Each structure stands twice: as C-alpha cells, then as structure tokens.
Swiss-Prot record, chain A:
Cross-link (Glycyl lysine isopeptide (Lys-Gly) (interchain with G-Cter in ubiquitin)): 6, 11, 27, 29, 33, 48, 63
Protein name: Ubiquitin
Organism: Pan troglodytes
Residues included from the entire protein: 1 to 76 of 761
Coiled coil stretches, renumbered: none
Mod. after translation: Phosphorylated at Ser-65 by PINK1 during mitophagy. Phosphorylated ubiquitin specifically binds and activates parkin (PRKN), triggering mitophagy. Phosphorylation does not affect E1-mediated E2 charging of ubiquitin but affects discharging of E2 enzymes to form polyubiquitin chains. It also affects deubiquitination by deubiquitinase enzymes such as USP30.
Swiss-Prot record, chain B:
Gene Ontology BP, a term: protein K63-linked ubiquitination
Name of the featured protein: Ubiquitin-conjugating enzyme variant MMS2
Key words of the record: Ligase, Phosphoprotein, Ubl conjugation pathway
Its job: Has a role in the DNA error-free postreplication repair (PRR) pathway. Lacks catalytic activity by itself. The UBC13/MMS2 heterodimer catalyzes the synthesis of non-canonical poly-ubiquitin chains that are linked through 'Lys-63'.
Note: Present with 2760 molecules/cell in log phase SD medium.
Assigned protein family: Belongs to the ubiquitin-conjugating enzyme family.
From Swiss-Prot, chain C:
Organism the protein comes from: Saccharomyces cerevisiae (strain ATCC 204508 / S288c)
Protein family according to the UniProt entry: Belongs to the ubiquitin-conjugating enzyme family.
Protein name listed in UniProt: Ubiquitin-conjugating enzyme E2 13
GO process terms (BP): free ubiquitin chain polymerization; postreplication repair; protein K63-linked ubiquitination; protein polyubiquitination; protein targeting to vacuolar membrane
The keyword Endoplasmic reticulum is assigned to this record: no
Length: 76, 135, 152
C-alpha cells in the first residue's frame, strides 16, 4: 500500500509499505529514498509520535495516510 | 546530468554531517582545493578480527570525470588486503566497485564495499602492521 | 539533446536580454542547466573592487526545488564557507516556485552587501566579525584583491 511523508522542509515523498511494516522498517525506506539516516528520523501520525517497536497497523495507519518527518533544524 | 562539483558538494554534506554508517568517514583532504579533487577516508576495522579496533586512513582522488569515472583509492595507513598493492596501497581498478562502477556509486558505497572485503569473507586475518605503520 | 522546460529557457534567455545590473549568468554548452555566474561586489561594501565567480545548477525538480549555488572565488564572509557554500534563506526554507534565478542571484549580491555573523556558515570568520568587525572588513577587502578579479 502507499503512504505519504511530509516534512517541515518541502518534500512530500510516497512510500510502498505493508500494514505489518514496523516503524523502524519505515525509517529505512525513508533513508533509501531521501538519504536520511534513521537515527535522526522522528515520525508523527495523527497527533502521535511513532515508536520503533510498533507496526503501521498498530497505529491504524492505512493507505494514503500522511506521516510527518521531523528533522532537527539546521542553520543557514 | 548533475555537474561534478555539485555531486561532490552533495557527498561532502553527508560526509561532514555524518549522514552515513559509523564504520566510515570521508571528506576533503584540505579546504584549499576549490575543485575538491583530493579526499581522505576512514574505515575502522571490522569487529572480531586483526582489523578489529583500528582506523584505516585512505586517500580518494576524485578526478575531473567523477562520478562518471570511478575515483582512485589508496591506503595511507599500512594494511594488508588483496585488492591493494603491497607497496603502494592502491586499490586495483579490477575491484568490483571500481570496475563495474556506475554514476550512482559513491565514496560511501566504495568504502563500505571495501570494508566488507575486510573481516575477509572467510577469516583471512593475514597479519597486520596495525600501529603507525604507514604505506 | 534532452529537452528543457519552457521555464528554464525563458529564464536563461531573459538573463542575457534583461540582465540583472552588475551580474552575469550563462549556461555551459554541454549542460544548459549549469551556469557560469559573476557578481560584482556591491559598491561601498568590503568587496567593492572585485568581481566574484559562482556556479549554479538547476535540479530536475526545479522550480519546486531551489537552484544550487556556490562561490568559486575564495571570499571572506561570515555566511560563505571555504568551499564557496552559501547559507541564505531563499535557497532553503524560503524557496518558492514564484522565485527565480535572477531573484536568487540578486539575493546573493544583497548578502555580500549586508553580512550576518549571528547565523554564520563559517564560524571562524563570524567570530572575527563579532570580536573585531572593522578588522574583518579589512581582511575581506584584502582577500578580494588577492583572489577576486579586479573591477575594470
């Protein structure tokens, strides 16, 4: 199924995922696509900050849900 | 079609902000070459081996045709792998990442693929100079 | 050849046709998304007697994604590092598709006019710029003479 990832920045990528995919498993996919390493990834869905040990289905994240990627703000 | 300079700046970011595995590090050999031709790299020995617990310092030459053409690697720190010349330290152009090399490859993938040959797909602990022994 | 978006082509052409005062930008024959750029150091600034070289590249997803820019001429500035990299809001969070190449270059020129050590890219430079401001202005004016092409 597909889900979207928005970010305070500007990007808005789409991911091919599975209801059973864990959060960690999702952070990885975000890496391959944008190059961002997981240990710096913060994910939020519908008011909830996601935890690595849980699946997408645990969070009731179904197709077309939009996750928000929180990245530590850089300087200019 | 991304110009060499910008591809390099792209990899420079990842290298300086550490966006990569802790086993490897890469960056400019010096902040004066505006062309970013010379780069230094590092690979800490794989765990449980003669390699285990040691930092390998390498030299990466990103030529004017990088990344269309692979870069030139060379072990600074003395070491003893096969694909590397026993006297110079150059990583032979036949090494799978060097040959086969594709634009999509990066100094990151290079160092990793190079760190795999370590821990030697076997036990090949050869016997290392380790120490401050340098090529 | 691999076509070019109507957007780029129109911008490229208008940069020559209706050039930004004190600034030039033209593409590489073998890469029309790659531009050679020169910007005159603002008048009255520490970089007034020089002409600075920069290069710029338009990414595929441009204009949704901001263009890439960096200085080639070595310059002493709190917001420009040893590799010519620039830290400017328009190139990042504030990028918008409404903006264009000319706006960006204008902005980089503006940046030379009024530095900002408080949100630096080169902290060593920035520190000199806070600790001893007039002295930094002098280092910059010197570096301009040393590394920039002299304004005719």
């Amino acid at each position: 199924m597909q889900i979207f990832v928005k970010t305070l920045t500007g990007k808005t990528i789409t991911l091919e995922v599975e209801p059973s995919d864990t959060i960690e498993n999702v952070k990885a996919k975000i890496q391959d696509k944008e190059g961002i390493p997981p240990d710096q990834q913060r994910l939020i869905f519908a008011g909830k900050q996601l935890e690595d040990g849980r699946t997408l289905s645990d969070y009731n994240i179904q197709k077309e849900s939009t996750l928000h990627l929180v990245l530590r703000l850089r300087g200019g | 079609k991304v110009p060499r300079n910008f591809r390099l700046l792209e990899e420079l970011e990842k290298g300086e902000k550490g966006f990569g595995p802790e086993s490897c590090s890469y960056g400019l050999a010096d902040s004066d070459d505006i062309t970013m031709t010379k780069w230094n790299g590092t690979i800490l020995g794989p765990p449980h081996s003669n390699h285990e617990n040691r930092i390998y310092s390498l030299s990466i030459d990103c030529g004017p045709n990088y990344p269309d053409s692979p870069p030139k690697v060379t072990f600074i720190s003395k070491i003893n792998l096969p694909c590397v010349n026993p006297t110079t330290g150059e990583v032979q152009t036949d090494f799978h990442t060097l040959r086969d090399w594709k634009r999509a490859y990066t100094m990151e993938t290079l160092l990793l693929d190079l760190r795999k040959e370590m821990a030697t797909p076997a036990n090949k602990k050869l016997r290392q100079p380790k120490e401050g022994e340098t090529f | 050849m691999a076509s070019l978006p109507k957007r780029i082509i129109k911008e490229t052409e208008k940069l020559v046709s209706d050039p930004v005062p004190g600034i030039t930008a033209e593409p590489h024959d073998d890469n029309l998304r790659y531009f050679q750029v020169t910007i005159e150091g603002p008048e009255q600034s520490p970089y007034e007697d020089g002409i600075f070289e920069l290069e710029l590249y338009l990414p595929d997803d441009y204009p949704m994604e901001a263009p890439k820019v960096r200085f080639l001429t070595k310059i002493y500035h709190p917001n420009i590092d040893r590799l010519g990299r620039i830290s400017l809001d328009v190139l990042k969070t504030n990028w918008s598709p409404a903006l264009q190449i000319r706006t960006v270059l204008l902005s980089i020129q503006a940046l030379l006019a009024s530095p900002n050590p408080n949100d630096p890219l080169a902290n060593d430079v920035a520190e000199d710029w806070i600790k001893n401001e007039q002295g930094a202005k002098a280092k910059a004016r010197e570096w301009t003479k040393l590394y920039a092409k002299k304004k005719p």
